Design a protein around this ligand. Structure first.
Ligand SMILES: *[C@@H]1O[C@H](CO)[C@@H](O[C@@H]2O[C@H](CO)[C@@H](O[C@@H]3O[C@H](CO)[C@@H](O)[C@H](O)[C@@H]3O)[C@H](O)[C@H]2NC(C)=O)[C@H](O)[C@H]1NC(C)=O
Ligand SMILES: *[C@@H]1O[C@H](CO)[C@@H](O[C@@H]2O[C@H](CO)[C@@H](O)[C@H](O)[C@H]2NC(C)=O)[C@H](O)[C@H]1NC(C)=O
Ligand SMILES: *[C@@H]1O[C@H](CO)[C@@H](O[C@@H]2O[C@H](CO)[C@@H](O)[C@H](O)[C@H]2NC(C)=O)[C@H](O)[C@H]1NC(C)=O
Ligand SMILES: *[C@@H]1O[C@H](CO)[C@@H](O[C@@H]2O[C@H](CO)[C@@H](O)[C@H](O)[C@H]2NC(C)=O)[C@H](O)[C@H]1NC(C)=O
Ligand SMILES: *[C@@H]1O[C@H](CO)[C@@H](O)[C@H](O)[C@H]1NC(C)=O
Ligand SMILES: *[C@@H]1O[C@H](CO)[C@@H](O)[C@H](O)[C@H]1NC(C)=O
Ligand SMILES: *[C@@H]1O[C@H](CO)[C@@H](O)[C@H](O)[C@H]1NC(C)=O
Ligand SMILES: *[C@@H]1O[C@H](CO)[C@@H](O)[C@H](O)[C@H]1NC(C)=O
Ligand SMILES: *[C@@H]1O[C@H](CO)[C@@H](O)[C@H](O)[C@H]1NC(C)=O
Ligand SMILES: *[C@@H]1O[C@H](CO)[C@@H](O)[C@H](O)[C@H]1NC(C)=O
Ligand SMILES: *[C@@H]1O[C@H](CO)[C@@H](O)[C@H](O)[C@H]1NC(C)=O
Ligand SMILES: *[C@@H]1O[C@H](CO)[C@@H](O)[C@H](O)[C@H]1NC(C)=O
Ligand SMILES: *[C@@H]1O[C@H](CO)[C@@H](O)[C@H](O)[C@H]1NC(C)=O
Ligand SMILES: *[C@@H]1O[C@H](CO)[C@@H](O)[C@H](O)[C@H]1NC(C)=O
Ligand SMILES: *[C@@H]1O[C@H](CO)[C@@H](O)[C@H](O)[C@H]1NC(C)=O
Ligand SMILES: *[C@@H]1O[C@H](CO)[C@@H](O)[C@H](O)[C@H]1NC(C)=O
Ligand SMILES: *[C@@H]1O[C@H](CO)[C@@H](O)[C@H](O)[C@H]1NC(C)=O
Ligand SMILES: *[C@@H]1O[C@H](CO)[C@@H](O)[C@H](O)[C@H]1NC(C)=O
Ligand SMILES: *[C@@H]1O[C@H](CO)[C@@H](O)[C@H](O)[C@H]1NC(C)=O
Ligand SMILES: *[C@@H]1O[C@H](CO)[C@@H](O)[C@H](O)[C@H]1NC(C)=O
Ligand SMILES: *[C@@H]1O[C@H](CO)[C@@H](O)[C@H](O)[C@H]1NC(C)=O
Ligand SMILES: *[C@@H]1O[C@H](CO)[C@@H](O)[C@H](O)[C@H]1NC(C)=O
Ligand SMILES: *[C@@H]1O[C@H](CO)[C@@H](O)[C@H](O)[C@H]1NC(C)=O
Lengths: 433, 123, 119, 119, 119, 48, 48
């Protein structure tokens, strides 16, 4: 005695993969083409809804990664190309008589290059870091002239991360987990519906997660497959540890013209003494942070095991060190003083190297030259999470990292995007006419 | 299990009016349709009116269709009937009853599930 | 609130259909996303039109319920189930139901045409 | 099948209208093609709406046939002709017919408004 | 003519609604402009659908006029005012009116559903 | 043949200095200019 | 045999066969390819 009744506007949805649009409340990740955000987003809590989430199958991560790369290339495209820099350099060490850890780290190189008029050349003396110059007065070349073209980043465009919000197009919705102790997978009991995500800063770092969000109650250890050594483990801390990192040298920046409408910026002089770039991490706070991480790891690996931390075993400097950008400079900090401990049942100083030629996003064939920044650089960041990898009685963990998609996951783990299916049918007692 | 109690007056003159009211308890008032059924002192009982659970729809028996108004208040849990032009043929005991209709998404009824005791209206 | 009734039972959830109906419509990739959203909206409106439901959110039809699609009691479906559980149960029969609705509307339109032909 | 009735007579062909109705909607140049397809669909739906036919595939009207547009017998048009031949015959008068349909619907809407005004 | 009645009084102007209705629909930036025009058209058609006015240009409703929105006489509104002056007067109450229209249609659809349930 | 519809008894308020058609005109002219010069010979070697 | 205008000498005639004829074509030489770099991120391939 029942009849089919058609309902339109049914609050039902299915998993979907769509294109999300940026929003923001000169910067590399800012644009006039990115829609302003609402002054007050509306979050609708969904009572008695238990959506199943999986942070490692989330299509928002690929969209985040691709859009960040696209914005990066768009920002570097309208800038000065450094093709003429691939010349033979004649170099000596800078401050060759200096006693320091930075003994030979800066080289004073001379080269002909060229100038506004094609018939003339302007001899240039400039300082380069050891990591940017490879032997070939001694003859050297820039490290990237054997691999790719170098594009100079525009000195007027800031590299400071700016929060980016992702907003679903009409017909789609984003479900925010909001549950406590959520390990990135399985049912979520406190699911709410939003149109736009919280602001996510495009912070680029390896090994350590900087300026992220924090766990509400406990350190959360997330892995696609905790028993698979080929997967990375993302650890989200409940409390941050402050890292004060600096380039104490007072660097003087000089510039020359290299063509019509083009200018090359380079590291000219160091005023005062040459000092090593480094990061300050409080020893007590870090030790407590690792103790908490070890307790949470023991919950998955056994209460009676021994957990050991060790330095990165190898690979490119981007993955063996803590790479990050602050102050407009790219720091590569050893971190061997942090991940060196065995866990059985004063401030620390991390040496850092600075590079001018950066090969970001693991893309070989497109290099960027970071202009030097005038003066002394000091930045204070919050370490809000860790990336760990692992290799019996003792389980050894290493910084790992290097795959930028995992950093996006550290913020996107709580969001899922779904498609709305407003049509449905149900039996009723209603007969048409 | 439930309580339904009629309130109303007694003797009126022909051509006048009288409002009757019933209070419900023990069940969700807003979930059931309500009806009025009347029994003349010497006759059997007959249906007078029907109101849906929400109250938007009302139906009447032809003999009263142009005079009686049926209304319900789901916040007060009360049913009211305003009668006009009480005729001698309208003298009866008027009972409130729960049932008689369902709002499409509920199992059908077409019966009067619960009854009150009745208000006696004379002319 | 948009989808606020998603965890609510089918009966109570059916009272907020206009909230989702309004929310469904409200670089090259973003433009493609907007065009696709419009195409999906129109596909749903066209499908309602084919069934003779072009102007309604709650549309009654002449297709009987088979009971093989779901044999639950009407009170169980509307008072105990949510729309997500119901969709999970009926998705196997959704194309059958849609085909029956299209055929029923075609028959109704022919019958109305013939009734209008009588002078 | 889509357009399977194209070579079939108008009478038999009128029984498959939902097949074409469903098929009509189902780089920068491709996106332009999709937007244009949507605009054409909406122009046809808007035109049906103007005539008061927004929810029907077979819509009866109050516009009389002039017989100058085509003086064929009803059985000749529906049992012997195809829709392509018919369109070829009526295309010269299609704009006239559309104008009459729009005027008729405007008059009908005003008449219904006045009937609704009576208390 | 398109908008020819814009300076005409509301009564006379209401007789040419199909002219504007037809005109509303008839590089990457231009494609965005076309998509936006389509989205705006659909938002207006969806809103009419929500109110139960999907197939009409002049749609009568069950929402009473409050008189606080405008207390002008009916002859003053329809014989002396233009549509632009009227819109300027009612824009402060337009969202209130739209909310009432949506609620009224939801109540009407539930009432029709219950009447159809009676056998 | 464009169709111009005269609006009787309409008094629209205009402001030529707040008109968004001017910015569209300027931007489109610049865009066309650059598009026309783009597929042409570069004179980089002339800086001698 | 298809032609826009078979009597117009300015048009091409396209002949579609009902059966194919197999053509075996080859470069019998065993060529060795060498390559050099010509710039950062660029390499030139040539017949060695
Ligand atoms: C994590 O967040 C902190 C705070 O938002 C970041 O520190 C901030 O970094 C920016 C850029 O390096 C600093 O802006 C600069 O300030 C100096 C002040 O003299 C100015 O001269 C520069 O032109 C520029 O505006 C900002 O002051 C600094 N904030 C603090 C409190 O020190 C940090 O860099 C973030 N971490 C990462 C990895 O991005
Ligand atoms: C790099 O080395 C050159 C010399 O090899 C430096 O130039 C000399 O600077 C001294 C003063 O310190 C002068 O007396 C010499 O006459 C300079 N020679 C030339 C050829 O310029 C140059 O300053 C060094 N670069 C930096 C940044 O200090
Ligand atoms: C890194 O830690 C050292 C201490 O180990 C900091 O040096 C101290 O800084 C304070 C504040 O300027 C001074 O009052 C102390 O006298 C300093 N001590 C020494 C031994 O120099 C240093 O400033 C920290 N680095 C950063 C970037 O904050
Ligand atoms: C092109 O010709 C040059 C010589 O003109 C070849 O190079 C010579 O090869 C012979 C061996 O066949 C050597 O003995 C000579 O010393 C080579 N001379 C030089 C200058 O390299 C060259 O090999 C020829 N190219 C090819 C592809 O055979
Ligand atoms: C610059 O070019 C001149 C050309 O005569 C050469 O003598 C000189 O050694 C070159 N210097 C460097 C640093 O390449
Ligand atoms: C030059 O490029 C090759 C490409 O494989 C690389 O293996 C080599 O290490 C590069 N040279 C230096 C000094 O890095
Ligand atoms: C969901 O999160 C909100 C955050 O304010 C909290 O108030 C609420 O109690 C949470 N619900 C559950 C079931 O944890
Ligand atoms: C972080 O977790 C540790 C685990 O022991 C707990 O003691 C500490 O209070 C937590 N802090 C916050 C702010 O939740
Ligand atoms: C995450 O938590 C759920 C809880 O049900 C568990 O089933 C799942 O295996 C956990 N996954 C990891 C990687 O810890
Ligand atoms: C993790 O990887 C191992 C590899 O052997 C596999 O056996 C195991 O089933 C995987 N776990 C899950 C949950 O897929
Ligand atoms: C760096 O040197 C410049 C030289 O002009 C001076 O003005 C500036 O104050 C110095 N900064 C520091 C931190 O020593
Ligand atoms: C970072 O700077 C703040 C500034 O007050 C200081 O208190 C803190 O100790 C510094 N961090 C370290 C590790 O020294
Ligand atoms: C960090 O310091 C240790 C000190 O033993 C050294 O062995 C290691 O190579 C350093 N890291 C890098 C990337 O060189
Ligand atoms: C770091 O954490 C502290 C905790 O009180 C917070 O006040 C500060 O704003 C955080 N900084 C950043 C950059 O997130
Ligand atoms: C969730 O279930 C409880 C169970 O009593 C109910 O009261 C509540 O209204 C439900 N949530 C919603 C949004 O209907
Ligand atoms: C119900 O579905 C079954 C299986 O498709 C079919 O055999 C049966 O005839 C259907 N009954 C009705 C009344 O449609
Ligand atoms: C084609 O014409 C023949 C003539 O008898 C008819 O039987 C056949 O059905 C026609 N084709 C279609 C698709 O109607
Ligand atoms: C039929 O069309 C002709 C030519 O347009 C016209 O003169 C005649 O009046 C029309 N008749 C009707 C009934 O519309
Ligand atoms: C403009 O006002 C005059 C006043 O009499 C009226 O006659 C005329 O029709 C109006 N214009 C339009 C287009 O209605
Ligand atoms: C008219 O509007 C006023 C102000 O919003 C309100 O107080 C009043 O109740 C409304 N009356 C009606 C009949 O809607
Ligand atoms: C193609 O064949 C048709 C058959 O009717 C003929 O009329 C036409 O002229 C032919 N064209 C050519 C180019 O052979
Ligand atoms: C082919 O071209 C000749 C050129 O003189 C012309 O006379 C003839 O009519 C053309 N044929 C057709 C079919 O157009
Ligand atoms: C061509 O020469 C290479 C030289 O290594 C040899 O390996 C290959 O087999 C030769 N192929 C033929 C077809 O002679």
């Amino acid at each position: 005695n029942l009849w089919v009744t058609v309902y339109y506007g049914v609050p039902v949805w299915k998993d979907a993969e769509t294109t999300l649009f940026c929003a923001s409340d000169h910067n590399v990740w800012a644009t006039h083409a990115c829609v302003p955000t609402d002054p007050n987003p509306q979050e609708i809590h969904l009572e008695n809804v238990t959506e199943e989430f999986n942070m490692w199958k989330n299509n928002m991560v690929e969209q985040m990664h691709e859009d960040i790369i696209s914005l990066w290339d768009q920002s570097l495209k309208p800038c000065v190309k450094l093709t003429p820099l691939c010349v033979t350099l004649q170099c000596t060490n800078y401050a060759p008589k200096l006693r320091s850890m930075m003994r030979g780290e800066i080289k004073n190189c001379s080269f002909n290059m060229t100038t506004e008029l094609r018939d003339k050349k302007q001899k240039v003396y400039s300082l380069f870091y050891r990591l940017d110059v490879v032997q070939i007065n001694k003859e050297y070349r820039l490290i990237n002239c054997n691999t790719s073209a170098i594009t100079q980043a525009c000195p007027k465009v800031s590299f400071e991360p700016i929060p980016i919000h992702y907003c679903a197009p009409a017909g789609f919705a984003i479900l925010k987990c909001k549950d406590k102790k959520f390990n990135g997978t399985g049912p979520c009991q406190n699911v709410s519906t939003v149109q736009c995500t919280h602001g996510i800063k495009p912070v680029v770092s390896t090994q350590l997660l900087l300026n992220g969000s924090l766990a509400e109650e406990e350190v959360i250890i997330r892995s696609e497959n905790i028993t698979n050594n080929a997967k990375n483990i993302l650890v989200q801390l409940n409390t941050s540890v402050q890292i004060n990192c600096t380039r104490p040298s007072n660097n003087t920046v000089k510039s020359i013209r290299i063509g019509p409408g083009q200018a090359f910026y380079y590291f000219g002089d160091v005023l005062g003494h040459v000092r090593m770039a480094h990061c300050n991490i409080s020893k007590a706070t870090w030790n407590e942070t690792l103790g908490k991480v070890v307790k949470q790891l023991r919950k998955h690996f056994g209460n009676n095991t021994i957990i050991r931390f060790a330095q990165s075993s190898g690979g490119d400097l981007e993955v063996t060190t803590h790479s990050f950008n602050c102050g407009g400079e790219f720091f590569y900090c050893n971190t061997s003083g942090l991940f060196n401990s065995t866990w059985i049942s004063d401030s620390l100083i991390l040496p850092c190297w600075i590079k001018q030629i950066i090969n970001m996003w693991q893309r070989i064939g497109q290099a960027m030259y970071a202009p030097p920044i005038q003066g002394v650089i000091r930045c204070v960041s919050n370490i809000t999470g860790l990336i760990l990898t692992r290799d019996s009685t003792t389980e050894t963990f290493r910084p790992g990292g290097g795959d930028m998609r995992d950093n996006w996951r550290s913020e996107l783990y709580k969001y899922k995007v779904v498609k709305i299916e407003p049509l449905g049918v149900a039996p009723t007692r209603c007969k048409r006419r | 299990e439930v309580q339904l109690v009629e309130t109303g007056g007694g003797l009126v003159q022909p051509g006048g009016s009288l409002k009757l009211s019933c209070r419900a308890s023990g069940y969700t008032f807003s979930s059931f349709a309500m009806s009025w059924v009347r029994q003349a002192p010497g006759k059997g009982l007959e249906w007078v009116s029907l109101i849906n659970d929400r109250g938007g729809l009302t139906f009447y028996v032809d003999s009263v269709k142009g005079r009686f108004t049926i209304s319900r208040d789901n916040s007060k849990n009360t049913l009211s009937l305003q009668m006009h032009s009480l005729r001698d043929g309208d003298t009866a005991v008027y009972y409130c009853a729960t049932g008689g209709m369902s709002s499409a998404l509920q199992s059908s009824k077409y019966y009067f599930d619960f009854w009150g005791q009745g208000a006696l209206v004379t002319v | 609130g948009f989808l606020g009734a998603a965890g609510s039972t089918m009966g109570a959830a059916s009272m907020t259909l206009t909230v989702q109906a309004r929310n469904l419509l409200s670089g090259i990739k973003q433009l493609q996303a907007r065009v696709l959203a419009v195409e999906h909206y129109l596909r749903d409106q066209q499908l309602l039109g084919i069934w003779g439901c072009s102007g309604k959110l709650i549309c009654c039809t002449n297709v009987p319920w088979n009971s093989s699609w779901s044999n639950r009691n009407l009170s169980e479906i509307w008072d105990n189930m949510t729309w997500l559980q119901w969709d999970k149960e009926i998705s196997n029969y959704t194309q059958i139901i849609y085909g029956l609705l299209e055929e029923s509307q075609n028959q109704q339109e022919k019958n109305e045409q013939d009734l209008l032909a009588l002078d």
